[PDB]
Design a protein around this nucleic acid. Structure first.
Lengths: 142, 103, 109, 117, 54
RNA sequence: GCUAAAACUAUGUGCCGAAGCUGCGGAUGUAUACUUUGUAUACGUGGUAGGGGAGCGUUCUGUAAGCCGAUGAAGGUGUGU
RNA sequence: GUGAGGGGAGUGAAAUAGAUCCUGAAACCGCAUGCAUACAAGCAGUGGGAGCACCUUCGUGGUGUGACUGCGUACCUUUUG
């Protein structure tokens, strides 16, 4: 029993702020998921949440390459017969920028109660302002 | 001070006064075991990492006794094939107490 | 130090008697007597008989005061069942079980 | 010589039920269900005594990767550098040092990258 | 139509979780001092002072 | 999710990766030498239908007109080993 | 309720030997205490593992529980399966 697990009462969560202007969606999402899960800390434990808080600003300025702005499709199903709804990236980014990041990061986090708890630490905002000045976030350039 | 030592095909990180269980040894109870194949010695800022080993370092320990771990049950069963067998196990160990670490 | 009374062989299902038992578990004796006196359940009569027997035992055999007593413990157990036959249609017969129960009441201060 | 089976049969069933302590529902009350449950538990234990070593090695490698990337190296480059420098400390001790002593791990990384250079 | 599996004691008790009984509304009659059921004549024939039986 | 790729072609340097191999501890089958030994070495130990070997418990008979038992047998129920 | 049933007193070595009465196992059904449980999907375990309660030789200890997490589609028969 010489390999120790991190204790939840001793975990420190730090606050960082990231600007999404001109970044590639998936290549930003992988780093965000890494830091949300806590893979960058030497006390990483699979069954304990050790990650940090990530605030995202300028969420509507994220980019995709190729023709994915018009051709990438988002689906959902209302469970009534025939209830498949469809949209694309360029309408979705104008309408609800935060749901794009939610989908992208949720697909990369684990599927379970710990994953649900981890995704609560990401805050996405369309504009350049956030209401979390009291937590004194640090600028992170990923 | 803490040191890294080899014993029983495995490695351990030890400090003075620690009690630890290793693979069964042939030494008798109350005897002294000396390790001269130290891999690493740390004292705060003073760090020594051996190329294979640290020259001149020593770790001395005392043999407390020998014993057996708790019993383990081994079960094998091939479903629908009329096959089943079982056996028990208790692994031997030796207990050591670290008395001296010198770099 | 609780005072006990038992009523064995009451002709009612324990599942039915338990509904009345948990209605008065833990209350003062006066409040429990009021509840039982104004209940319309059949098990209320039996539970009240047991409770008054327990109160009488506590007052007479142990010389306690009725004002301080409470229903500290009460539970209902299953008793011996009687087996009967009920004839059904087309020559078939079914088995009928008539259930009984035991009621235990403990009062204390 | 007529033999009755009660005592021995009761002992065997009671031992199985005692080993089935803590399971849900009929798995800890009913002999048939309990007997099936104990065998499956044994099979799982046999398999997991092998799975445990892999899981702990994965944990050590992840912690060493985090420490190396804190010191400016990747895990693979750090391992190659240590092998070239001839240090033979294993991953369990390396991960312990990475967790509990940052300065010593920094010294190890310095040695590894010096050997890589 | 009948069950394919026997129902467990846990689910049976969960179904019965809505079977508890409820107390009646009782009140002390001011005219006679006895406990009676609210809005009802007492056992000896009194209600709001007036008596039913001589 | 990915577009000077996280795609395809070619080359190179590292690493991960199995109950495979190696390390440490323990058990067992056969054979060769110790010229009893229970000892060393070598090679083995996934298994249905089947074949071979060695054992644990239960009831009754002798040993037993013995040995244990109201200072508590059998049986039941826990705990430790 | 002059009922059934019980609580005292008394007998007895023993009344949880009190009348369908030696011993009184399991399925099955209650009450009490400790812990967990009302945002989370599956043979219900297994390998890890925080917290809590009691005990304690105060411990790298014992007992109960098990948040979170990797893996994981019962048994028998009959079959190419």
């Amino acid at each position: 029993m010489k390999t120790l697990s991190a204790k939840p009462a001793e975990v420190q969560h730090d606050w960082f702020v990231v600007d999404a202007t001109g970044k590639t969606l998936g290549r930003l999402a992988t780093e965000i998921a890494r830091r949300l899960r806590g893979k960058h800390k030497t006390s990483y434990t699979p069954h304990v949440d050790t990650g940090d808080y990530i605030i995202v600003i300028n969420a509507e300025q994220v980019q995709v390459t190729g023709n994915k702005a018009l051709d990438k499709k988002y689906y959902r199903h209302t469970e009534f017969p025939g209830g498949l709804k469809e949209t694309n990236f360029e309408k979705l980014v104008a309408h609800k920028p935060e749901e794009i990041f939610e989908r992208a990061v949720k697909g990369m986090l684990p599927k379970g109660p710990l994953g649900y708890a981890m995704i609560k630490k990401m805050k996405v905002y369309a504009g350049s302002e956030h209401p979390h000045a009291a937590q004194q976030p640090q600028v992170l350039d990923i | 001070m803490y040191a890294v030592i080899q014993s029983g095909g495995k490695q351990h990180r030890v400090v003075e006064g620690e009690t630890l269980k290793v693979e069964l040894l042939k030494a008798e109870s109350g005897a002294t075991i000396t390790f001269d194949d130290v891999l690493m010695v740390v004292n705060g800022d003073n760090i020594q990492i051996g190329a294979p080993v640290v020259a001149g370092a020593k770790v001395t320990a005392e043999v407390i006794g020998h014993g057996r771990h708790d019993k383990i049950r081994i079960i094998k069963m091939r479903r629908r094939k009329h096959y089943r067998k079982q056996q028990g196990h208790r692994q031997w160990f030796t207990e050591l107490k670290i008395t001296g670490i010198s770099g | 130090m609780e005072v006990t009374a038992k009523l064995r062989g009451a002709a009612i299902s324990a599942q039915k008697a338990r509904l009345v038992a948990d209605l008065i578990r833990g209350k003062s004796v006066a409040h429990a007597l009021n509840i039982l006196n104004f209940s319309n359940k059949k098990a209320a009569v039996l539970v009240k008989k047991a409770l008054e027997s327990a109160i009488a035992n506590a007052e007479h055999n142990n010389s306690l005061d009725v004002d301080d007593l409470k229903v500290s413990t009460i539970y209902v157990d299953e008793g011996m069942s009687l087996k009967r036959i009920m004839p059904r249609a087309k020559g078939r017969a079914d088995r009928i079980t008539k259930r009984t129960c035991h009621i235990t009441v403990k009062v204390g201060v | 010589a007529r033999v009755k089976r009660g005592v021995v049969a009761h002992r065997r069933h009671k031992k199985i039920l005692a080993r089935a302590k803590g399971y849900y529902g009929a798995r800890s009350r009913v002999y048939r269900v309990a007997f099936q449950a104990v065998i499956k538990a044994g099979q799982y234990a046999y398999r997991d005594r092998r799975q445990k070593k892999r899981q702990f090695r994965a944990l050590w490698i992840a912690r060493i990767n985090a420490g190396a990337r804190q010191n400016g190296l990747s895990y693979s480059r750090m391992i190659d550098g240590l092998k070239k420098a001839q240090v033979i400390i294993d991953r369990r001790v390396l991960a312990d040092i990475a967790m509990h002593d940052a300065v010593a791990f920094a010294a190890l990384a310095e040695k590894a990258k010096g050997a890589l250079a | 139509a009948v069950q394919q599996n026997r129902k467990s004691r846990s689910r049976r008790d969960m179904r019965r979780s809505h079977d508890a009984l409820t107390e009646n509304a009782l009140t002390v009659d001011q005219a006679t001092g006895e406990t009676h059921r609210r809005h009802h004549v007492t056992k000896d024939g009194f209600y709001r002072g007036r008596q039913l039986f001589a």
